[PDB]
Structure formats: C-alpha cells, structure tokens
C-alpha cells in the first residue's frame, strides 16, 4: 500500500520516532506498512503495533463516549430539538472507529494469526482480536451485535486456553489477557459474577507463582496484578 516503497527496517525506525513524538496515527500507519511486508513480527515489533492502535482507538472511544452522552441528553424529556447534527457527528466518529477496528482485525486475519505458532505470539494476537471485537461491540446496536460479542468471546477464549496450557500464571501477556477478558464479561457480556471470579482466580494463581521470579519480572507481574485488584475493588 502507501508504505509499499519504504524499507521494513525504516518503517520500524519511524514507528519508534512517532511514538517519541506522540504521533500515534503516523505510528499506526508505519506499523501497518511493516505488517504488510509479510514477515512475522518480533516481540518488540508486536508491542509497537499494539501501542500505536491502542492510542488511536483509545482517542476515538473517548470522543465517541462524549458525543453519545450529549446525544442521550438530547433525547430526554424537556430537551429542545437541535436537529440531526449531534447524531450525524456521533455517527461520523463511530464510522471512523469501526474503520480502525476493521483495519486491525484485517491485519490479524491477513496473516498474523495464522503464522503465529509460539504461544507468546499467538496469545498476543488473539487478545488483540478479542479487544478490537470488544471495541466494535461497545458501539453496536443492530442485528449483528450478538455475533460481534460472540466473535470477541471466541477469540478471548482461544487465547485463554493456550495461555493456561503454555504460559506461567505470572506471565504478563496471560495476566493482561485475563484482565481484559474479565472486563469483557463485566461491561459487554452482562456477566459481572464471571468477571469477578476470573479476576480473583487470576490474581490468586499469580500470587502463588511470584516466588519463582527475578526482581524485574516480579515488578512487571505485580503491576498488572494491581490492575486486577483495582477492578475487583471497583466491582465489590
């Protein structure tokens, strides 16, 4: 595509520069270009890909929430009619968000997931698949909402099955997957009890494995464990 003429290594280098400059749209475009070279991604490169799109979609989600709240208020009793503009602009932002999600899901399907054989890579990409279907579910209101939710669930579940077989309970990818799948249960699937159970079991199994870790690995795992605890505190 647009980045077809730039070297893979140059795209990676520029993604890192874009991150330093907080230019996340550029970062995402560079990493899309790097994926489309067709080679597998290293650990570092996978994290550049995820950081870039997380920041782009994160801004879109925040904007969508603002606009949705204004729209909800416009449709309350006693609200004066202001015309189609709030709905139109919310729809514009929504369409852009859906486009970013479709872009990410497209990269995963063509062909990151199918070439990922190691547990660390495969779980990482399946977590991404679940996350981006979750973002589509957040804005879905139509005939496909159930199918979108089931697509998220299925991706998370495959990732969980691999992670439990192949990774220690303190592995950061495994922990972050569980954190996000727990949020899926609470916020998307209307299953708060499942969310709470998953967060608690994950935390406790990680606690019991901390003794095996170096100082630096301990720091990484305990950071994510604290996010599990934070959600449990929010929900209980």
């Amino acid at each position: 595509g647009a980045m077809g003429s730039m070297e893979r290594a140059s795209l990676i280098q520029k993604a890192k520069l874009a991150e330093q400059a907080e230019r996340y749209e550029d970062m995402a475009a560079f990493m899309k270009g790097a994926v489309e070279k067709g080679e597998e991604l290293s650990c570092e490169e996978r994290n550049l890909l995820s950081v870039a799109y997380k920041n782009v979609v994160g801004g879109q989600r925040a904007a969508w929430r603002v606009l949705s709240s204004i729209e909800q208020k416009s449709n309350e009793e006693g609200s004066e009619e202001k015309g189609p503009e709030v709905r139109e602009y919310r729809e514009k932002v929504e369409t852009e968000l859906q486009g970013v999600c479709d872009t990410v899901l497209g990269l995963l399907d063509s062909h990151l997931i199918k070439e990922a054989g190691d547990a660390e890579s495969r779980v990482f990409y399946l977590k991404m698949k679940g996350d981006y279907y979750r973002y589509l579910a957040e804005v879905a209101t139509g005939d496909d909402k159930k199918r979108i939710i089931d697509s998220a669930r299925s991706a998370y579940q495959e990732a969980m099955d691999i992670s439990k077989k192949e990774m220690p309970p303190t592995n950061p990818i495994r922990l972050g997957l569980a954190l996000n799948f727990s949020v899926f249960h609470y916020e998307i699937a209307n299953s708060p009890e499942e969310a709470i159970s998953l967060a608690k079991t994950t935390f406790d199994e990680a606690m019991a494995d901390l003794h095996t870790l170096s100082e630096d690995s301990y720091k990484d795992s305990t950071l994510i464990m604290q996010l599990l605890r934070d959600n449990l505190t929010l929900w209980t």
Binding site: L179, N180, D230
Partner: peptide, 5 residues
C-alpha cells in the same frame, strides 16, 4: 471505567 491493557 475499569482498567484494561
């Protein structure tokens, strides 16, 4: 909103 990574 709850924490995700």
């Amino acid at each position: 909103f709850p924490a995700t990574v």
